[PDB]
């Protein structure tokens, strides 16, 4: 490159990783020094242009030449945005004489963008353990039966005229004729989770557990809460929960762990005493009388049978949060003994809440909720359920730390690798489309939020990845290599690590086959290897992300994860045959003559003419680190 009236887009880079931003989670008094990469000698000037919410105006900061990279291929330019408490948004103007390019979260543009600016949100922190962790999601009835004494039996109780059914471990999840799918119980419990902490924390290496609901409720899924304050007896008691939490937190039995609970705060069950549709309590619920002590906890359109609910399910009546200081806001979060606080305080001290159905609870309520949660424990995580762009609950730093990454992770991964959407409908995307989808969805979020997103291949509300993949376990390998090297918390839905299959609910909640929970299962062996690799390299958790190859002919995707210390080129082959790939590691400033090691195999390579040449099997990958 040269000063030649032309900005060369291929040389340009910025994100908020360590090489480019010295303060990605600044306080009010920390200035933000930003670096923009270009090809060496390519440009004549560059400017940071930032919107300041303090004065509703743009501000321009001229940049200066900072340095070359070690390979001598690139310049870095630098400039500093001043310290203050205000939210700010920035982009770059990049000039080479009569040529101008713009650059922001969406990359380069010939025209000035007005969306996808980078974020500066002073004093907004997400928990660093969430950014750096690996999460394991457990649907408790189906993971491990640690104790038969608490098992629900066939006919133990009835709910809305149907008896419960016990089914044998490993059998079909579908209720036998006459029974109901939501009242089928395999016997998994908290004691079982406790007994399997060595599998989770050592055999795999995950350090965060996320549980589907565990509080008293008549169904097997327990999203129809009857008592927020009691562990459901099928799963244990509150003392079992305390013991489980202390064993999760222990550093003596594996890495220090964290527990995130499912907070079902949009709605209760229809059998909650506040509602009491079936008169299970002496008290009078909202369904029973318009003079009920809890009548105003719900919203009736025509009392008693037409009321607000989750998605039209009459079993899930929607809570009326009223306005600030209301009784409902009190019992859920404000009161010293609220549901949200109770589990965050001793003797529980859980590490976060996953917010079920969170889009149906307004932004004011989530802002108050954040204050309640973070006031007890500033390092307790708040992850909202949302299937789209969760910017409205994340990008001002006043509500959630992150969201369930359906839109930025689960869907594009599904469509690229399996050719199906996550509901197993036909929907395929190319490698260029995959890369574009990923970039646009990252750009929806502040960097800390991106790094804290819950990135799962499957969950309890979508079809299993291994079913979408038609049973080809190598598609799971590929998905795992991507998952464990991408931006956001890798989240393993129990069983995905061994290739568990399953269609739509309830078949996505099969009982876990413990014969497969060893490194003799090749997917488990790869999962363990990848978690070890992710835990070795901060660049994989909090590093920059740069696209390197998007090859739609050979179905090759390559990207770099890199920081001040490490440079890692991930190379993924989404074809059904091997490809030998020339990896442009020069883009990551890996020097000529240096060595890289594929951390999956231990195979070593030498960088030549900016390239590493590696053979990658179909539906597999290499993780080329130095």
Residues that bind Ca ion (CB under 5 A): 1, 4, 6, 42, 96, 145, 147, 150-151, 187, 189, 276, 279, 281
Of the pair 15, 189, the CB lying nearest Ca ion is at 189
Task: Compute the least distance from the CB of residue 288 to Ca ion, in Å.
Answer: 5
Does an H or E element contain 342, and which? helix 339-344
Task: Compute the least distance from the CB of residue 230 to Ca ion, in Å.
Answer: 16
Residue-by-residue DSSP string for 437-491: HHHHHHTTS-HHHHTT-EEES--TTS--HHHHTTT-HHHHHHHHHHHHHSSSEEE
Of the pair 4, 112, the CB lying nearest Ca ion is at 4
Of the pair 179, 281, the CB lying nearest Ca ion is at 281
User: Residue 363 to residues 145, 146, 371, 581: CA-CA distances in angstroms?
Assistant: 39, 40, 13, 47
Return the closest-CA partner of residue 139 out of 222, 196, 217, 206: 222
Task: Compute the least distance from the CB of residue 100 to Ca ion, in Å.
Answer: 11
Of the pair 225, 431, the CB lying nearest Ca ion is at 225
Strand, coil or helix: 88: strand
Task: Compute the least distance from the CB of residue 188 to Ca ion, in Å.
Answer: 7
Strand, coil or helix: 373: helix
- Name every residue whose Cβ is closer than 8 Å to that of residue 336 and which is 6 or more positions away in sequence: none
Return the closest-CA partner of residue 507 out of 461, 470, 473: 461
The answer on whether 151 is annotated among ligand-binding residues is yes
Tokens linked to 170? 């490993």
Angle, alpha carbons 63-65-69 (nearest 5°): 130
Return the closest-CA partner of residue 75 out of 28, 41, 34, 106: 41
Antiparallel, parallel or unpaired: β 162-163 and 620-625: unpaired
Q: From the candidates 351, 385, 435, 563, which is the catalytic residue?
A: 385
The answer on whether 66 is annotated among ligand-binding residues is no
Helical segments of 91-169, H only: 128-131
Does an H or E element contain 533, and which? helix 522-536
| Cα(48)–Cα(262) distance, integer angstroms | 41
Of the pair 287, 545, the CB lying nearest Ca ion is at 287
Task: Compute the least distance from the CB of residue 120 to Ca ion, in Å.
Answer: 29
Residue 112 annotated to the active site: no
The answer on whether 575 is annotated among ligand-binding residues is no
Residue 25 annotated to the active site: no
- Decide: 121 and 27 in contact? Cβ < 8 Å: no
Of the pair 2, 229, the CB lying nearest Ca ion is at 2
Of the pair 296, 425, the CB lying nearest Ca ion is at 296
Task: Compute the least distance from the CB of residue 615 to Ca ion, in Å.
Answer: 36
Phi and psi at residue 478, in whole multiples of 5°?
A: -60, -50
The answer on whether 6 is annotated among ligand-binding residues is yes
Of the pair 195, 367, the CB lying nearest Ca ion is at 195
| Cα(79)–Cα(73) distance, integer angstroms | 21
Task: Compute the least distance from the CB of residue 305 to Ca ion, in Å.
Answer: 16
For the four alpha carbons of 478, 483, 485 and 487, in that order, the dihedral sign comes to: positive
| Cα(445)–Cα(118) distance, integer angstroms | 9
Of the pair 144, 416, the CB lying nearest Ca ion is at 144
Q: From the candidates 356, 401, 435, 563, which is the catalytic residue?
A: 356
| Cα(454)–Cα(456) distance, integer angstroms | 6
Strand, coil or helix: 65: strand
Does an H or E element contain 183, and which? none
| Cα(579)–Cα(485) distance, integer angstroms | 20
Residue-by-residue DSSP string for 555-619: TEEEEEEE-SS-EEEEEEE-SSS-EEEEE-GGGGTPPTT-EEEETTT--EEE-BTTBEEEEE-TT
| Cα(77)–Cα(490) distance, integer angstroms | 33
Of the pair 6, 345, the CB lying nearest Ca ion is at 6
Task: Compute the least distance from the CB of residue 356 to Ca ion, in Å.
Answer: 24
The answer on whether 13 is annotated among ligand-binding residues is no
Strand, coil or helix: 375: helix
Task: Compute the least distance from the CB of residue 196 to Ca ion, in Å.
Answer: 13
The answer on whether 187 is annotated among ligand-binding residues is yes
Task: Compute the least distance from the CB of residue 1 to Ca ion, in Å.
Answer: 5
Binding residue positions for substrate: 267, 354, 460-461, 505, 509
Binding residue positions for Ca(2+): 2, 4, 6, 42, 96, 145, 147, 150-151, 187, 189, 276, 280-281, 283, 288
Residues forming the active site: 356, 385
Binding residue positions: 2, 4, 6, 42, 96, 145, 147, 150-151, 187, 189, 267, 276, 280-281, 283, 288, 354, 460-461, 505, 509
């Amino acid at each position: 490159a040269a000063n030649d009236n032309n900005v060369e887009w291929n040389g340009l880079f910025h994100d908020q990783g360590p090489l480019f931003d010295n303060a990605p989670e600044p306080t009010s008094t920390q200035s933000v020094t930003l670096k923009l990469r270009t090809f060496k000698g390519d440009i004549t000037s560059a400017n940071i242009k930032y919107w300041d919410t303090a004065d509703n105006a743009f501000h321009w900061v001229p940049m200066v030449w900072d340095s070359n990279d070690p390979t001598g291929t690139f310049d870095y330019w630098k400039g500093t945005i001043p310290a203050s408490p205000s939210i700010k948004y920035y982009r770059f103007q990049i000039n080479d004489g009569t040529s101008t390019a713009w650059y922001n979260g969406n990359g380069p543009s010939s025209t000035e963008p007005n969306a996808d600016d980078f974020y500066i949100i002073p004093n907004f922190k997400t928990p660093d353990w969430l950014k750096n962790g690996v999460m394991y999601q457990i649907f408790p009835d189906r993971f491990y039966n640690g104790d038969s004494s608490n098992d629900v039996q066939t006919g133990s109780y009835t709910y809305n005229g149907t008896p419960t059914e016990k089914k044998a471990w490993g059998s079909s999840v579908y209720a036998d004729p006459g029974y109901d799918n939501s009242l089928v119980f395999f016997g998994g419990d908290l004691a079982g989770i406790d007994q399997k902490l060595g599998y989770i924390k050592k055999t795999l290496g995950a350090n965060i557990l996320y549980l589907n609901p565990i509080f008293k409720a008549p169904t097997n899924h327990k999203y129809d809460t009857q008592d927020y304050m009691a562990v459901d007896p099928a799963f244990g008691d509150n003392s079992t929960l305390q013991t489980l939490i202390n064993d999760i937190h222990s550093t003596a039995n594996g890495p220090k762990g964290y527990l995130i609970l499912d907070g079902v705060f949009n709605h209760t069950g229809d059998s909650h005493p506040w509602f009491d549709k079936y008169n299970n309590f002496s008290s009078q619920g909202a369904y029973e009388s318009q003079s009920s002590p809890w009548y105003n906890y719900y919203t009736f359109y025509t009392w008693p049978d037409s009321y607000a609910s989750f998605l039209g399910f009459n079993s899930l009546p929607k809570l009326n949060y009223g306005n600030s200081g209301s009784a409902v806001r009190g019992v859920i979060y404000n009161n010293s003994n609220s549901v949200a606080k109770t589990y965050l305080n001793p003797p529980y001290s859980v590490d976060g809440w996953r917010l079920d159905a969170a889009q149906y609870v307004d932004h004011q309520i989530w802002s108050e909720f954040r204050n309640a949660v973070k006031g007890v424990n500033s390092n307790a995580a708040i992850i909202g359920e949302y299937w789209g762009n969760a910017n409205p609950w994340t990008a001002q730093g006043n509500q959630w730390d992150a969201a369930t990454n359906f839109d930025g992770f689960t869907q594009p991964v599904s469509e690229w690798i399996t050719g199906k959407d996550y509901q197993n409908n036909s929907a395929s995307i190319s490698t260029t489309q995959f890369d574009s989808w990923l970039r646009g969805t990252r750009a929806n979020y502040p960097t800390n939020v991106q790094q804290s997103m819950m990135n799962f291949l499957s969950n309890h509300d979508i079809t299993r990845f291994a079913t979408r993949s038609g049973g080809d376990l190598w598609k799971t390998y590929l998905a795992l290599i991507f998952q464990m090297t991408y931006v956001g918390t890798p989240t393993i839905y129990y069983g995905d690590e061994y290739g568990m299959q399953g269609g739509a609910d309830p078949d996505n909640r099969r009982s876990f086959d413990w014969s497969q929970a060893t490194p003799s299962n090749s997917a488990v062996a790869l999962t363990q290897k990848l978690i070890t690799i992710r835990n070795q390299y901060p660049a994989l958790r909090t590093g920059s992300f740069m696209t390197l190859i998007t090859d739609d002919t050979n179905k090759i995707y390559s990207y770099g994860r890199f920081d001040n210390v490490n440079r890692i080129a991930v190379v993924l082959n989404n074809d059904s045959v091997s490809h030998t790939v020339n990896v442009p590691v020069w883009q990551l400033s890996m020097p000529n003559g240096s060595t890289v090691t594929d951390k999956i195999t231990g195979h070593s390579y030498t960088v030549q003419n900016g390239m590493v040449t590696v053979a990658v099997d179909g539906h597999y990958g290499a993780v080329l680190a130095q």
